[PDB]
Design an enzyme around this catalytic site. Sequence first.
Site, short mmCIF file in Angstrom:
data_model
loop_
_atom_site.label_atom_id
_atom_site.label_comp_id
_atom_site.label_asym_id
_atom_site.label_seq_id
_atom_site.Cartn_x
_atom_site.Cartn_y
_atom_site.Cartn_z
N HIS B 46 45.36 32.44 46.15
CA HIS B 46 45.16 33.62 45.33
C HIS B 46 45.21 34.89 46.18
O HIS B 46 45.47 35.97 45.67
CB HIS B 46 43.84 33.52 44.56
CG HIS B 46 42.63 33.77 45.40
ND1 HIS B 46 41.79 32.76 45.83
CD2 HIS B 46 42.11 34.92 45.89
CE1 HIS B 46 40.80 33.28 46.54
NE2 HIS B 46 40.98 34.59 46.59
N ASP B 97 43.59 26.09 44.94
CA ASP B 97 43.49 27.37 45.62
C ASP B 97 43.53 27.16 47.13
O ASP B 97 42.51 27.16 47.82
CB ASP B 97 42.22 28.08 45.19
CG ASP B 97 42.27 29.57 45.47
OD1 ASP B 97 43.36 30.13 45.69
OD2 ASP B 97 41.19 30.20 45.46
N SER B 198 36.73 35.46 50.27
CA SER B 198 37.78 34.61 49.77
C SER B 198 38.71 34.15 50.86
O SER B 198 39.05 34.93 51.73
CB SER B 198 38.66 35.39 48.79
OG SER B 198 38.12 35.33 47.50
#
Lengths: 10, 247
Positions: B46, B97, B198
């Site tokens: 992502h 992911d 992230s």
Amino acid sequence: CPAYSRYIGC
Amino acid sequence: IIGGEFTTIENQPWFAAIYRRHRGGSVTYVCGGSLISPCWVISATHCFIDYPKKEDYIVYLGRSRLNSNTQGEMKFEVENLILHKDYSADTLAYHNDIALLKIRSKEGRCAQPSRTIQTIALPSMYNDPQFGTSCEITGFGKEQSTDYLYPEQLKMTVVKLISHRECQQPHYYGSEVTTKMLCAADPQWKTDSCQGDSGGPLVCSLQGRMTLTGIVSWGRGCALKDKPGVYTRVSHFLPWIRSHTKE
């Protein structure tokens, strides 16, 4: 962008 | 990182800092990642899905500060940017992911271990540690959900792996946590990863080895009661990984 993203972009 | 402590790269020397250069020349932070072999950094798909040109990215290793330089850091270009084909962003969460970056310095080198740069081992396929085990997360992410700025110094904290059953509880995440994900949170809900962590590592000791058990993926809020951080379950992606890492 999912509601719970932890991405800077979101 | 919510709660936890300011730290330096030496206590997390696998941690990679990933940035993107914009049309102007301006460069901004994108996501964390982890050095899993000298030429390979692993992160989350992502982070890159919006701007998938590998040319626009820079990876730092050995970096303890967000917007300034650290003694010993090394800058890399991205020679291959591998997003997962089955990646998807749902309404609340992300699936598959996981992403891989092959790094090359402008001088053609992969990373060289130093006091501030080391690789982190992958787990054995489908081998994950017990629920309630304490793991480490690291990043340049927000110190509070509500913040607008990001910390200048690297942080880390400790969280415990949560059972799937617990995780699949409705007052937790219910159906949305799948077996290819791991949950981890603070028993008192005081520390967590947050926005900007992230792609970063979840590192757990497995057998005796410090191992990359997760990749920061999603969670509702940060350090919010009954809503754990959710991570890509690395042990489930060894074939995907080994296919690309063997070149």
